[PDB]
Design a protein around this ligand. Structure first.
Ligand SMILES: [Mg+2]
Ligand SMILES: [Mg+2]
Ligand SMILES: [Mg+2]
Ligand SMILES: [Mg+2]
Ligand SMILES: [Zn+2]
Lengths: 50, 31, 177, 156, 94, 38, 174, 82, 157
RNA sequence: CCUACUUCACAAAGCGCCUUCCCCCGUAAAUGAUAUCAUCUCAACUUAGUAUUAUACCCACACCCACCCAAGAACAGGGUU
């Protein structure tokens, strides 16, 4: 998971956009999403998301 | 089955997907 | 230029007879071409109210080809008004029943959904085989290029072409093959 | 880096070789010169020009009428030169500018023949169940121009 | 005169006759009529283009609903070109 | 045959073939072991 | 030509005289219909290519009628034949080897005992009939209420469809 | 040796630039049809609608009349251009 | 190549075994195709390439014999299946017994056929727009192929 | 459909008589590669397998006085030698 985070070729991450409020995205995001970094959605957890 | 997301949220999820690195030549093809 | 008004008008809005060969061609690509010509969209003088559509003749509609498993998968659905009148047949079944049906239906689908459509269908002429009526043959002007380039069979390749392509691997001498 | 001839070995589009700049420059000179010579001699017949006037591109010829949707602050019968010619074409040659042809090259002349109001145009607003209904009548000032002449001078 | 065809102003009968007389006046070969282009021959709405050739050189091409009408049209085109009443003729200088 | 979402070979003589676009377990020794992918 | 397997011969046009009983040696009684063949002639032959059909056709006419009551077209056709006009003309699909020259008379001995035949006619017209006589609908009971419902069609269609299906059994001409 | 478009149907297009590079010059003389490319000149309402439909490759609908309302609506003196 | 001959005596005889072209453009290539820079540059159409890796009766040759890359073996396998179904290999017909003469069957021209025609069931009930049952065209194994057009291969129709 | 029987009687009916034609597909097997055995094959393929069923019916058009009718609400249809 750590390796995938470091290895990622995508310039845009959920964390980066969410923290900076890049498209006014905090409007459609939970305050919890800042900490969850888009990995967690409700009770469900995505292991495949960086 | 998951809860329906806002379209803007879903778009963000789609944009922020892990892209694995691709070498110029496949490692198997290399000696 | 320098024509009289009536012959000028006549030349501009004249109907043109085109020929298409349907041999080893997808119906949809033929339909795409036919639809363009039937509506008159190929003509730069085009307008909906100008009825400037052109005649399209398609031959070898029996010898059409489908990509994938569309002969089996694609289903044509029709309902006679009566209860239990719903009939579903595969593309293969319809083709055996009526050779011109698939190309006809494809073109009909791609035509605009208005009152002009059916008149445009009158300009369409479909023939299953090589044979075309003599009157229709006399009308023809241009043969449109086939939308799909047919791949050559192995036997169709010349000796020159075979020798041009390299051997990629060396088989063992003691192998049965 | 050789690849044996297959379907996907080579791009489907044919190989295109463009002429060498030196030869092409020479060729361009010859073409320009003969077109210039035609202009000198007067081989051309009727000319058509694409003119930019009042926000719109007008394909005009001699003795052509155009309707301009504004007042031009010109007395009727006044001859004006339309600048901003994009394209000037004959039977056998066309000259098109980047984006405008030079003043020396082409001259198009028109005259004001008519200054009129447009026919009344109705503006109507209605929203159901809101008691919302408005009516306005507008007439737009208009000018009619007669394109008198298009002339070309040998400047290439 | 503006915006008018020559033969709209000057009514003519048998333009082919006029053409042959004019060409023999200029000491060239009599024109040869050939079908340049054709569409929907058997139909109720055919288009025919016929061309006139003098020593295998094109002088005029004319469209018509029939071959005979096309011939007449080609002849009129020829006469227009000879007399200099082409549509694309230099406009009148005022 | 019995329909199974997951196919298991029940003995050694069981064998797994794709026929008619779906997986099957066939067994000549024990015919009861026959299974069809659902 | 001699008969071959797959070949079909022409039929006849007969007049329905009536019925009488017939007995068999086993003792069973069978009712039979009498069909009289009256002035049955072959009228026209059409080839398969000309007919634009699968088989060659013979038009055969029966039961001579008045010349005065026929149209000019029909009269002209019969004049060319040299036969008086016939009430009905029916078309028989035949093979090429079964072709017969027009004008040739046809007789009852064309058929032979032990052979099976198909008979086609217009049925007796009962005019406009209700559902009970037309489709054998059960109808509604006589008493125990039933104000105005004795012979009526019940529910014609279903509630959900806001219409009546094509080919529903309704009162009409039978 | 290079042509952007095949010059055999409409006209022979030659593209050039003026020395300054401000004006694009196009020379397009018309292409004339050769002699060789040419060819020598040779020497009952119901049924009626069907005949007309076939003759002009139309549907039957066109050939049916319309009522007085539509006939009288039509402009018998329409504006003419050119 | 070895031929077995039965005349009862059975012998094995070696005929002319064809050999690789003298100089490959990319030496130190692991695959046979990797060597000739033909990784993503062949389709079902390319019968010259495909005929090299098949038995006379149409069957695929084993990976070890040909020394193909596993990935490329799978690609060639499915390409040859498509080639057969498209009718591009008429000389590699199955070994039919002399007695058995194939009955006349209706002919349908096809190409880019992934599945065996017998196995596929008709799509009687295609879904709504949002969940549509689509007809597969071409193999996903050929997804990595070089794409000259801007639009990628539409794998599902 | 009306010869009998029965309700009845120039006829309509059943309680009476006559006629009534093709298949379905889930699997069961050969040969045979990937995976030199084997393997019914979302391998190329071979049979049960039948595929598009097909054939039947209908099909010429006076006067549209009048009369008749086994045709019919009207209209239309059949007959009037
Ligand atoms: Mg009762
Ligand atoms: Mg009562
Ligand atoms: Mg009451
Ligand atoms: Mg009558
Ligand atoms: Zn077992």
């Amino acid at each position: 998971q750590e390796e995938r985070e470091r290895n990622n070729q995508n310039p845009w991450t959920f964390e980066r956009i969410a923290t900076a409020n890049m498209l006014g995205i905090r409007k459609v995001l939970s305050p919890y999403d800042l900490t969850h970094k888009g990995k967690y959605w409700g009770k469900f957890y995505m292991p495949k998301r960086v | 089955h998951r809860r329906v997301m806002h379209f803007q949220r879903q778009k963000l999820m789609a944009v922020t997907e892990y892209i694995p690195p691709k070498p110029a030549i496949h490692p198997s093809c290399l000696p | 230029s320098s024509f009289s008004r009536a012959p000028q008008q006549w030349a501009t809005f004249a109907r043109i007879w085109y020929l298409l060969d349907g041999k080893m061609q997808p119906p949809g690509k033929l339909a795409a071409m036919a639809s363009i010509r039937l509506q008159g969209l190929h003509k730069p003088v085009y307008h909906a109210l100008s009825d400037c559509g052109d005649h399209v003749v398609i031959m070898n509609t029996r010898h059409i080809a489908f990509s994938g498993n569309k002969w089996e998968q694609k289903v044509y659905s029709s309902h006679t008004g009566y209860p239990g009148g719903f009939r579903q047949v595969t593309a293969a079944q319809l083709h055996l029943r009526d050779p011109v049906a698939i190309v006809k239906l494809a073109i009909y689908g791609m035509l605009p959904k208005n009152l002009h459509r059916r008149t445009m269908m009158e300009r369409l002429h479909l023939f299953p085989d090589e044979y075309i009526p003599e009157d229709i043959l006399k009308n023809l002007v241009e043969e449109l290029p086939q939308p799909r380039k047919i791949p050559k069979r192995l036997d169709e390749y010349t000796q020159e072409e075979i020798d041009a392509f390299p051997r990629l691997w060396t088989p063992p001498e003691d192998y049965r093959l | 880096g050789y690849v044996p001839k297959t379907s996907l070995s080579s791009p489907p589009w044919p190989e295109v070789v463009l002429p060498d700049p030196v030869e092409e420059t020479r060729h361009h000179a010859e073409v320009v010169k003969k077109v210039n010579e035609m202009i000198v001699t007067g081989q051309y017949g009727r000319l058509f020009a694409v003119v930019h006037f009042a926000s719109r591109q007008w394909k005009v010829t001699s003795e052509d009428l155009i309707l301009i949707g504004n007042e031009l602050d010109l007395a009727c019968g006044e001859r004006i030169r339309l600048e901003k010619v994009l394209l000037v074409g004959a039977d056998n040659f066309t000259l098109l500018g980047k984006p405008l042809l030079g003043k020396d090259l082409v001259r198009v002349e028109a005259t004001v023949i008519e200054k009129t109001e447009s026919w009344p145009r109705i503006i109507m607003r209605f929203r159901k169940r809101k008691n919302f209904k408005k009516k306005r009548i507008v007439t737009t000032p208009q000018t009619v121009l007669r394109i008198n002449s298009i002339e070309i001078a040998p400047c290439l | 005169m503006t915006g008018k065809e020559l033969f709209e102003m000057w009514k003519i009968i048998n333009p082919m006759g006029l053409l042959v007389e004019e060409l023999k006046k200029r000491n060239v070969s009599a024109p040869e009529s050939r079908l340049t282009r054709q569409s929907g021959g058997t139909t109720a709405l055919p288009l025919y283009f016929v061309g006139l050739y003098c020593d295998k050189k094109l002088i005029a091409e004319g469209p018509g609903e029939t071959v005979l009408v096309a011939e007449e049209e080609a002849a009129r085109v020829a006469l227009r070109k000879l007399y200099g009443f082409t549509e694309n003729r230099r406009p009148w200088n005022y | 045959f019995k329909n199974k979402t997951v196919l298991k070979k029940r003995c050694k003589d069981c064998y797994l073939v794709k026929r008619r676009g779906r997986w099957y377990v066939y067994c000549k020794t024990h015919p009861r072991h026959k299974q069809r992918q659902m | 030509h001699p008969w071959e397997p797959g070949s079909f011969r022409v039929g006849l046009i007969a007049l329905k005289l009536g019925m009488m009983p017939l007995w068999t040696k086993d003792g069973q009684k069978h009712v039979v219909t009498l069909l009289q063949v009256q002035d049955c002639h072959v009228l026209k032959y059409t080839s398969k290519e000309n007919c634009n059909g699968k088989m060659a056709t013979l038009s055969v006419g029966g039961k001579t009628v008045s010349r005065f009551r026929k149209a000019t077209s029909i009269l002209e056709f019969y004049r060319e034949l040299g036969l008086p006009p016939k009430q009905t003309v029916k078309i028989f699909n035949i093979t090429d080897n079964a072709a017969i020259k027009p004008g040739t008379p046809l007789y009852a001995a064309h058929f032979r005992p032990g052979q099976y035949v198909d008979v086609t006619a217009k049925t007796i017209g009962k005019g406009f009939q209700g559902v009970m006589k037309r489709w054998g609908f059960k109808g509604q009971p006589a008493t125990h209420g039933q104000t105005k419902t004795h012979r009526r069609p019940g529910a014609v269609a279903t509630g959900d469809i806001g219409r009546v299906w094509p080919g529903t059994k309704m009162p009409g001409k039978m | 040796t290079y042509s952007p478009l095949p010059d055999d149907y409409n006209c022979n297009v030659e593209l050039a630039l003026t020395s300054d590079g401000r004006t694009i010059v196009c020379y397009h003389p018309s292409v004339d049809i050769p002699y060789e490319h040419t060819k020598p000149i040779p020497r009952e309402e119901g049924p009626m609608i069907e005949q007309l439909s076939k003759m002009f490759f139309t549907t039957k609908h066109r050939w049916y009349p319309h009522g007085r309302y539509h006939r009288c609506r039509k402009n018998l003196n329409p504006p003419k251009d050119r | 190549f070895r031929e077995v001959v039965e005349t009862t005596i059975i012998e094995g005889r070696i005929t002319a075994t064809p050999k690789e072209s003298p100089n490959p453009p990319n030496p130190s290539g692991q695959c046979p195709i990797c060597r000739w820079n033909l990784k993503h540059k062949y389709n079902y159409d390319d019968v010259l390439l495909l005929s090299q890796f098949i038995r006379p009766h149409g069957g695929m040759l084993p990976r070890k014999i040909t020394g193909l890359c596993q990935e490329e073996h799978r690609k060639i396998e499915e390409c040859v299946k498509m080639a057969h179904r498209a009718g591009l290999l008429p000389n590699h017909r199955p070994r039919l017994p002399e007695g058995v003469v194939p009955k006349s069957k209706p002919q349908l021209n096809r190409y880019l056929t992934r599945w065996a025609p017998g196995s596929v069931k008709p799509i009687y009930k295609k879904g709504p727009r949002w969940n549509r049952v689509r007809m597969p065209v071409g193999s996903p194994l050929l997804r990595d192929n070089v794409c000259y057009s801007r639009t990628p291969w539409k794998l599902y129709h």
